Ligand binder design. Structure first.
Ligand SMILES: Nc1ncnc2c1ncn2[C@@H]1O[C@H](COP(=O)(O)OP(=O)(O)O)[C@@H](O)[C@H]1O
Ligand SMILES: [Mg+2]
Ligand SMILES: [Mg+2]
Length: 297
């Protein structure tokens, strides 16, 4: 419900002045998603290595949500949220400068290596802390999935990519926009119901399936087919559930409840006994290294 001009006016009011091509150098592309292309670069003045997300505003899936992105990343700082540094607007290109997490994304790990249950529990704990913080501040992320989870080389876990997020209010306490990535969407999203923060808990459940099986269900299917499969299959089935502990299977079942009221909240799932199996995050470091080497080769 915002025009292109209203969106650009709002973005201009919140970014810093200047052209960032004069402030950063030695760019190298490290990732790309539905909104932006992300580079490493060096701050010309200081030498710091940063990450820079470059977004072309007219090629955006929903233009006005980029406002929430900058606002949420800088107004809701937290140890499990990628650290915002700055933002710039050059006509129709928006840049967001943030800390660089050299371990890459959780996608790199789950597609190249096999996490054990203690490593999965550790990652789930960190993601649940982030979600409890966001949800308590009335932010729904709406795009939880492995490629939006960043890793430090020491195993630090940080949520990024707030470009689909919703800030919910008393007058609009639920959302109804079809937004997210189809394979990770909760059934109440795909069936076009009003929905709330627990859609992120479902998506976390699907990301935990990624940590087991390397990918979410139905990844090869056309998006509209996947949406119908989510609507009719309900709680997805694992290929080999007998390989997982009973306590881990219970955690998954509580993330992936069809009934929104039965589904765990972030605060509730932080008390789940599965998280007591967690290993130190430093245990991720050999998986991170092995994944980077495999991708390089
Ligand atoms: N700060 C960062 N450090 C390291 N890698 C990053 C960082 N930010 C993004 N990436 C990588 O770039 C990809 C795209 O970034 P993201 O912000 O998710 O863009 P989009 O909104 O287009 O999906 C991420 O999935 C991740 O692999
Ligand atoms: Mg992304
Ligand atoms: Mg995004």
């Amino acid at each position: 419900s915002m025009t292109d001009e209203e969106i650009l006016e709002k973005l201009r009011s919140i970014v810093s002045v200047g052209d960032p091509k004069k402030k950063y150098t030695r760019f190298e592309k490290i990732g790309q998603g539905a909104s932006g292309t992300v580079y490493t670069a060096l701050d010309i003045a200081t030498g710091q290595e940063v990450a820079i997300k470059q977004m072309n505003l007219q090629q955006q899936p929903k233009k006005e949500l980029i406002i929430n992105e900058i606002l949420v990343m800088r107004e809701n700082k937290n140890p499990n949220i990628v650290n915002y540094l700055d933002s710039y607007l050059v006509g129709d290109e928006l840049w967001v400068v943030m800390e660089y997490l050299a371990g890459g994304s959780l996608t790199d790990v789950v597609t190249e290596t096999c996490m054990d249950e203690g490593q999965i529990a550790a990652v789930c704990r960190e993601c649940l802390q982030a979600l409890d913080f966001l949800h308590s501040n009335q932010v729904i992320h709406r795009d939880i999935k492995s490629d939006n989870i960043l890793l430090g080389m020491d195993g630090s876990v940080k949520l990024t990519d707030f470009g689909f997020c919703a800030q919910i209010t008393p007058e609009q306490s639920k959302r109804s926009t079809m937004v997210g990535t189809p394979y990770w969407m909760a059934p109440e999203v795909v069936t076009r119901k009003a929905y709330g923060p627990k859609v992120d808990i479902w998506s976390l459940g699907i990301m935990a399936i990624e940590m087991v099986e390397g990918e979410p269900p139905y990844l090869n299917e056309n998006p509209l087919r996947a949406l119908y499969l989510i609507a009719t299959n309900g709680t997805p089935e694992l290929q080999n559930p007998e390989r997982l502990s009973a306590v881990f299977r219970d955690f998954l079942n509580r993330c992936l409840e069809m009934d929104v009221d039965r589904r765990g909240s972030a605060k509730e799932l932080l008390q789940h006994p599965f998280l007591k199996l967690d290993k130190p995050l430093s245990s991720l470091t050999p998986l991170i290294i092995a994944a980077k080497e495999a991708i390089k080769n």
